[model samples]
Target: GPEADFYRFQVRERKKQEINQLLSKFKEDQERIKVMKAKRKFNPYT
Candidate 1:
């Protein structure tokens, strides 16, 4: 199918890239929290 209205491929690519960056950041944060929890259990004071 072709466009019925104005479309910009570059803009779409940029949006996808931005979404990927966000997802990557989320994944990194989750892994970091998991490691921190493990460390806390390994050295618990209470």
Candidate 2:
């Protein structure tokens, strides 16, 4: 029982880390898109 709990805890921690990494990347992409949209709105050549 103890071993199972330990493994489950490890899995939970790993999943949390994976989710956080993905969220960070998603936030970065969102920021990049916002910047691009602003630039497009102001540029006359596009």
Candidate 3:
């Protein structure tokens, strides 16, 4: 309200949420790309 140090705390909250969620999404994207690249297929039994 009057520069009592809560500004940065408030700022970092929303910023961190975006950064954290973005990282999680990117990790999942890698998996889809890897499988779609044809690295693993079903041809023979293991």
Q: Say which candidate scores most in TM-score.
A: 2
lDDT of 1 at 11: 59
TM-score result, candidate 2: 0.49
Candidate 3, residues 1-46, lDDT tens digits: the string is: 5675688777875467777889999999988887787755565666
lDDT of 2 by residue, 1-46 (tens): 9999999999886667668999999999989999879755466775
Candidate 3: residue 13 Cα off by (Å): 11
lDDT of residue 12 for candidate 2? 85
Question: TM-score of each candidate?
Answer: 0.47, 0.49, 0.44
Task: Summarize candidate 1's per-residue lDDT along 1-46 as a digit string, tens digits.
Answer: 2562336655564467668999999999989989878754465554
Q: Candidate 3, which segments miss by more than 4 Å at Cα?
A: 1-15, 40-46
Window of ten residues with lowest summed lDDT in model 3: 37-46
User: How far out, in Å, is residue 17 in model 3?
Assistant: 1.7
Q: How do the candidates rank by lDDT, highest first? A: 2, 3, 1
